[PDB]
Amino acid sequence: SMTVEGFFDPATCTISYLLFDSGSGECALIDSVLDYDPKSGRTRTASADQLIARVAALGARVRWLLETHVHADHLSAAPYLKTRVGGEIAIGRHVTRVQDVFGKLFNAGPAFAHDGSQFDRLLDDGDTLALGALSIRAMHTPGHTPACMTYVVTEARDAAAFVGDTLFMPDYGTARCDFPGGDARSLYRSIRKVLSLPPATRLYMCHDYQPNGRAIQYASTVADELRENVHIREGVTEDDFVAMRTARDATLDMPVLMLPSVQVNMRAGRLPEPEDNGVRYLKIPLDAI
Amino acid sequence: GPGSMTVEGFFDPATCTISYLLFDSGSGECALIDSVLDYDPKSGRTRTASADQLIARVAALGARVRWLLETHVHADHLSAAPYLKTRVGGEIAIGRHVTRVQDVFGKLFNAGPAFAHDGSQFDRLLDDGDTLALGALSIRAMHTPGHTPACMTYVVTEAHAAHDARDAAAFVGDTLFMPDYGTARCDFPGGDARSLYRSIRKVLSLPPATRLYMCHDYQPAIQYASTVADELRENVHIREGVTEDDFVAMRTARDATLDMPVLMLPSVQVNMRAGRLPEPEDNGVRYLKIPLDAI
Ligand SMILES: [Ca+2]
Ligand SMILES: [Ca+2]
Ligand SMILES: [Cl-]
Ligand SMILES: [Cl-]
Numbered sequence: 156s157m158t159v160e161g162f163f164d165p166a167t168c169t170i171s172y173l174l175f176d177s178g179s180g181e182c183a184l185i186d187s188v189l190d191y192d193p194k195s196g197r198t199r200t201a202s203a204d205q206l207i208a209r210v211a212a213l214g215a216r217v218r219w220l221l222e223t224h225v226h227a228d229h230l231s232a233a234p235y236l237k238t239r240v241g242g243e244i245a246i247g248r249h250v251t252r253v254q255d256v257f258g259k260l261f262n263a264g265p266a267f268a269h270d271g272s273q274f275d276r277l278l279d280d281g282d283t284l285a286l287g288a289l290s291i292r293a294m295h296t297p298g299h300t301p302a303c304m305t306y307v308v309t310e311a312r313d314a315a316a317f318v319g320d321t322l323f324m325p326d327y328g329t330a331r332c333d334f335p336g337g338d339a340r341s342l343y344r345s346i347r348k349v350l351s352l353p354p355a356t357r358l359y360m361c362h363d364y365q366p367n368g369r370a371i372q373y374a375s376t377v378a379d380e381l382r383e384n385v386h387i388r389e390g391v392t393e394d395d396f397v398a399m400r401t402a403r404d405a406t407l408d409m410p411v412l413m414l415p416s417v418q419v420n421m422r423a424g425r426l427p428e429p430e431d432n433g434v435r436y437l438k439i440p441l442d443a444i
Numbered sequence: 445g446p447g448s449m450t451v452e453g454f455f456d457p458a459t460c461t462i463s464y465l466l467f468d469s470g471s472g473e474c475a476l477i478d479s480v481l482d483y484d485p486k487s488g489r490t491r492t493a494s495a496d497q498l499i500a501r502v503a504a505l506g507a508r509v510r511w512l513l514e515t516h517v518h519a520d521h522l523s524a525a526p527y528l529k530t531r532v533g534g535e536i537a538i539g540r541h542v543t544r545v546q547d548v549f550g551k552l553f554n555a556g557p558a559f560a561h562d563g564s565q566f567d568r569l570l571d572d573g574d575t576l577a578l579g580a581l582s583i584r585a586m587h588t589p590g591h592t593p594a595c596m597t598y599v600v601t602e603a604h605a606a607h608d609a610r611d612a613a614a615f616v617g618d619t620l621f622m623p624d625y626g627t628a629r630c631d632f633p634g635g636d637a638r639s640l641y642r643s644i645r646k647v648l649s650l651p652p653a654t655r656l657y658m659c660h661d662y663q664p665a666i667q668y669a670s671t672v673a674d675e676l677r678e679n680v681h682i683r684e685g686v687t688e689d690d691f692v693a694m695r696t697a698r699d700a701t702l703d704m705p706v707l708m709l710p711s712v713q714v715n716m717r718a719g720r721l722p723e724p725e726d727n728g729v730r731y732l733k734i735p736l737d738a739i
């Protein structure tokens with residue numbers, strides 16, 4: 156009835172998803188990657204082209220291009236995909252807060268809108284998106300960023316939820332909360348909301364880092380998380396989690412692709428407009444963050 | 445035997461760069477070569493820890509810095525030459541063909557007319573054969589292109605040497621590496637393997653006892669120096685017997701397998717301005733520019 160296919164990118168450890176309703180052919184793509192080499196400034200389309208090819212092989216029609224949040228670890232390929240498979244690009248409405256902060260950091264100037272108008276749909280908690288016979292509910296789950304959404308898919312429970320970076324596989328734990336607007340106490344509460352779904356609900360992760368050298372994995376369940384999550388299993392209190400997450404964040408370095416990712420993703424994945432020589436430039440602020 | 449000169453190398457673990465302090469203890473005059481401003485590309489943060497080590501050693505020696513020398517326009521680290529100039533003095537010098545590098549990379553970074561392509565950001569532009577005085581020592585700039593169009597090898601000798609104090613030291617930049625590691629890549633704009641072969645042959649025509657101080661150690665513990673004799677005998681790429689054509693074929697094939705250096709784009713846009721950072725935008729913040737799909 157629902158088909159979920161994950162596509163793992165070794166360079167950024169991101170899992171992008173194809174969500175398919177067999178009965179209608181209607182499809183959503185979630186958290187796509189535009190391949191980017193920060194050493195050379197080169198972009199490639201190999202990861203997004205794999206999604207396009209699978210869409211075509213399934214005879215699928217893409218209706219939604221969903222972002223769980225404004226990613227700091229890879230560039231989105233949403234505009235590239237929209238041109239080539241269709242669909243509407245959607246993200247949580249609090250992307251506008253990210254635009255305000257990062258528009259300032261990158262000195263984006265007056266041509267860069269802070270109203271989320273680069274996106275087709277801005278989503279509020281509880282909004283639903285139709286996908287053939289399925290319904291996708293946008294559940295606001297802030298903590299890693301203030302804009303994070305978890306997409307809960309059911310027949311219009313036997314549910315699936317795309318949790319973004321709100322959870323990892325149980326053996327890895329939880330995501331950092333030191334992005335601007337991030338908050339560990341919020342993340343704890345948003346995780347408790349996700350783990351309030353029925354226990355057999357499948358949870359699909361945005362990232363996997365293969366702790367202890369195990370195989371790549373990116374699906375868990377609400378039950379397995381409550382039982383085994385190394386940071387936030389049943390029994391862990393909010394205060395204890397906040398203290399752990401805050402200390403753990405304090406010791407982290409900046410994600411390698413933070414500055415390139417955020418300036419692109421805050422524009423719905425559009426690249427900066429060309430300068431007068433016809434070249435587009437990412438801007439890296441010195442000693443500013 | 446060896447000059448009276450003192451050479452101390454400072455290895456940076458992040459970039460594998462070796463920066464040098466060259467000291468004439470008799471006069472107290474000093475040169476600093478190939479300094480590093482520490483730079484984290486993930487966050488845009490700079491630090492001065494590497495440069496501060498050079499400053500502290502200069503002060504402990506009672507030395508006075510007269511020269512801040514670059515062997516070439518570096519693609520693997522940002523220079524700290526201006527930060528050093530302000531705090532220890534000295535003139536910043538590089539080979540005159542830096543102007544060619546400025547033409548190419550001024551365009552790549554769209555730096556515009558405020559960025560001069562005449563080398564005026566540097567205090568001294570050096571031609572082959574130029575000598576720089578350093579107390580009882582003399583530094584001869586030998587042009588050794590190949591890795592880049594501008595590379596210089598700085599050959600140091602006592603200006604007026606007794607019989608047993610005639611041996612030279614040369615700071616070779618990224619031409620030769622240690623014998624077991626070979627030679628540097630030649631795929632930077634204006635780089636040329638055939639030129640590099642010829643330049644290395646010139647460096648290896650210096651007297652056999654000449655000490656050769658390396659710009660990097662990529663296999664660190666640290667190996668700072670080789671000699672002309674050892675390089676001619678042992679260098680895995682360009683020992684005696686390797687023909688020019690064979691070296692070019694090897695070097696070309698090898699370059700094709702390499703990725704871009706991590707700091708290539710931040711380094712060249714700062715080092716083409718003698719290590720100055722870009723001027724701030726209207727909001728008071730300085731930005732590095734990363735060209736998309738342009739190189
Ligand atoms: Ca994330
Ligand atoms: Ca070099
Ligand atoms: Cl606006
Ligand atoms: Cl904050």
Ligand SMILES: [Cl-]
Nearest residue numbers: 632633634635
């Ligand atoms: Cl060329």
